[PDB]
C-alpha cells in the first residue's frame, strides 16, 4: 500500500493523468518488475475507454507495490516525462522536506464550514455577540487546546443557575477556528436536563443518533428496547468514524451522565450547576468556575445593549441597587433589561422597588433563557438537594445577605462540635452555588441576594418568623454566657446591627 502523501500524489495528478497516458503501455512493465499479475493486467488491458484502464491502473496498483517507484521510472521512458517530473518533484517535496502544511488553511471560508455547517449540524447554539465575557470564553478555549491531545477528559464549566455557562460554551466553540477542525474533527452538543432514571440512557440514545449518517436515519429502529451495555457498545462502535470528536453536555444534572461519558471514554465539555458530579469521574478533572458578573462587567453588559450610564449620584446608586440585588447574574439582568421598557433610570428604579416587594416574580420576562424567572431554574437546584441540606438552605433566609458571617452565628438557625453546620453549608455552595465560602479571617460563609429573594417568597411564611425567633433566642442565650472587617465575637450577641433588614423580613412573616 502507499500512504497519505503518495496517494495525495496519485490523486493530485489526475487532471494530468487523463490528458496523456495508457495503462497497457505499463502493464508488461509492471507484469515485469513484479508488481502486477496477468489477471490484474487482463482486467486492465481489455477495457473500452481509456478512463477505464486509468481508474483500474490506479486502484489495482496500490495493493501490490511497496511504494510508488515503478511508475516514476516509467513516465520517463514513455515520452510522458512531463508527468514523472511533476511526481519526482513532489516526492522530493516530501522525502526531502520535513515540512508541508500541518492542520491549517488552504481552501478558505471555513466560515461556512466550521461556523455554518459543522456547528449547526452538531446542534451548537448561535453564540452570543453583543457582549462576550473575555476571561472565561478565553480560558475555555485555552484549556480545550491543552487537551486536544488527550483521549478522554472532563471540562466542567460549572456555576450558578443562569450564571451564563452555556452561552460561554456557545461562544468558545463559535469564535475560534481551531477547536473545530484543528484540535477536534467534529462537534456534538447535547442538552441533558435529565431527572428521571430513564433520562441518562435516553440521552446517549440521541448521541448514538447525533452520530448516525444522513443515510440510515430512515432505518431508525424501535431502538428504545436494548440494554444499556448494547447502546454503549453501539456508540463506542459508531465512534470509530469519529477521530478527535468534542462532546458538549449542556446542563447536566445526573452523575450517571458523567459515568456513561467515562465508561465510553468520551471527550467532554459539561455545563452544570452542581459541581460535585465530578467525583463520579476518576480522572484529570479540570475546572473553570463561572463567577457572578463583577460590577464593571455589569456596566459593560448594560452599555453593550444600549443602556444609558448614570450621572446623578442617586442614579449610579440606583444601578448599584440593581447590581446588588441580582448579585451579578446574567439571566436576571437580561430579564431585567427586556422589561425596562422606556429605558429611563426612573422606570429602572421602579423595578428596583418591584423586586423587594414581589420577589423574582416582579421582573420575570421573555428571555433567551428557557425559564420565565430565575426562580424556575433554582427550583430544580433545590429539589435535588439532600433533605437535610434542603433544610439548612430553607433556613438561611433569616440571615443577612451580602454579609460575611461566622459558622456559630449560623448554628443558631440551622437544624440537626458543630462544624457539621459548615459541612452542610459547603455541600450547599458546591451544589448550585447557592452560598459562598471564604476561608479566613474566620471560617465564614455568606448568602447572596438573588439566592435570598428566591427563598423570601418561597419558604413557608411561618418558618421565616420562626427562624427570626430561633435566632433572637440562641442569640440571647449567647448573651447569658456572660466593611473589610469580620464581625467580632465580643459582638455576636446583638444581630441588631442588621436590624434594618431584619426588620423587613419580620413584617413579611407576621403581617
Amino acid at each position: 500500500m502507499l500512504c497519505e502523501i503518495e496517494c495525495r500524489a496519485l490523486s493530485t495528478a489526475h487532471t494530468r493523468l487523463i490528458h496523456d497516458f495508457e495503462p497497457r503501455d505499463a502493464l508488461t512493465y509492471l507484469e515485469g518488475k513484479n508488481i502486477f499479475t496477468e489477471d490484474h493486467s487482463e482486467l486492465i488491458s481489455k477495457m473500452s475507454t481509456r478512463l477505464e484502464r486509468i481508474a483500474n491502473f490506479l486502484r489495482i496498483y496500490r495493493r501490490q507495490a511497496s511504494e510508488l517507484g515503478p511508475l516514476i521510472d516509467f513516465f520517463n521512458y514513455n515520452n510522458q516525462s512531463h508527468l514523472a517530473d511533476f511526481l519526482e518533484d513532489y516526492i522530493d517535496f516530501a522525502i526531502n522536506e520535513p515540512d508541508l502544511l500541518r492542520p491549517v488553511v488552504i481552501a478558505p471560508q471555513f466560515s461556512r464550514q466550521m461556523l455554518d455547517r459543522k456547528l449547526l449540524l452538531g446542534n451548537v447554539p448561535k453564540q452570543m455577540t453583543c457582549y462576550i465575557r473575555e476571561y472565561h470564553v478565553d480560558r475555555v478555549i485555552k484549556k480545550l487546546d491543552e487537551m486536544c491531545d488527550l483521549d478522554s477528559f472532563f471540562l466542567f464549566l460549572h456555576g450558578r443557575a443562569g450564571s451564563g455557562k452555556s452561552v460561554i460554551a456557545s461562544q468558545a466553540l463559535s469564535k475560534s477556528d481551531q477547536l473545530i477542525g484543528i484540535n477536534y474533527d467534529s462537534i456534538v452538543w447535547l442538552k441533558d436536563s435529565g431527572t428521571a432514571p430513564k433520562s441518562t440512557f435516553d440521552l446517549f440514545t440521541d448521541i448514538l443518533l447525533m452520530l448516525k449518517s444522513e443515510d440510515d436515519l430512515l432505518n431508525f429502529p424501535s431502538v428504545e428496547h436494548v440494554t444499556s451495555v448494547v447502546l454503549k457498545r453501539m456508540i463506542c462502535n459508531a465512534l470509530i468514524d469519529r477521530p478527535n470528536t468534542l462532546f458538549v453536555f449542556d446542563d447536566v444534572v445526573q452523575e450517571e451522565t458523567i459515568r456513561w461519558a467515562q465508561e465510553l471514554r468520551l471527550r467532554c465539555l459539561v455545563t452544570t450547576r452542581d459541581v460535585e458530579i465530578s467525583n463520579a469521574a476518576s480522572q484529570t478533572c479540570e475546572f473553570i468556575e463561572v463567577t457572578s458578573l463583577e460590577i464593571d462587567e455589569c456596566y459593560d453588559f448594560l452599555e453593550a445593549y444600549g443602556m444609558p450610564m448614570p450621572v446623578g449620584e442617586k442614579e449610579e446608586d440606583v444601578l448599584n441597587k440593581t447590581i446588588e440585588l441580582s448579585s451579578g447574574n446574567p439571566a436576571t439582568l437580561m430579564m431585567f433589561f427586556k422589561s425596562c421598557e422606556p429605558k429611563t433610570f426612573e422606570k429602572m428604579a421602579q423595578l428596583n422597588n418591584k423586586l423587594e416587594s414581589r420577589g423574582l416574580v416582579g421582573v420575570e420576562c421573555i428571555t433567551p433563557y428557557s425559564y420565565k424567572s430565575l426562580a424556575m431554574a433554582l427550583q430544580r437546584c433545590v429539589e435535588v438537594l439532600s433533605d437535610e441540606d434542603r433544610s439548612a438552605l430553607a433556613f438561611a433566609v433569616v440571615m443577612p445577605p451580602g454579609v460575611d458571617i461566622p459558622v456559630k452565628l449560623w448554628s443558631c438557625v440551622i437544624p440537626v462540635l458543630d462544624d457539621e453546620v459548615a459541612d452542610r453549608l459547603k455541600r450547599l455552595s458546591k451544589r448550585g452555588a447557592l452560598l459562598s465560602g471564604k476561608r479566613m479571617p474566620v471560617l465564614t460563609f455568606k448568602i447572596d441576594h438573588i439566592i435570598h429573594m428566591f427563598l423570601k417568597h418561597v419558604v413557608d411564611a411561618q418558618t421565616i418568623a420562626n427562624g427570626i425567633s430561633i435566632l433572637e433566642q440562641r442569640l440571647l442565650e449567647i448573651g447569658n454566657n456572660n466593611e473589610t472587617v469580620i464581625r467580632p465575637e465580643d459582638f455576636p450577641k446583638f444581630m441588631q446591627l442588621h436590624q434594618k433588614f431584619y426588620d423587613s423580613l419580620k413584617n413579611f412573616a407576621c403581617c
Partner: peptide, 5 residues
Amino acid sequence: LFNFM
C-alpha cells in the same frame, strides 16, 4: 416547607 419547591 418550600411551596412546591
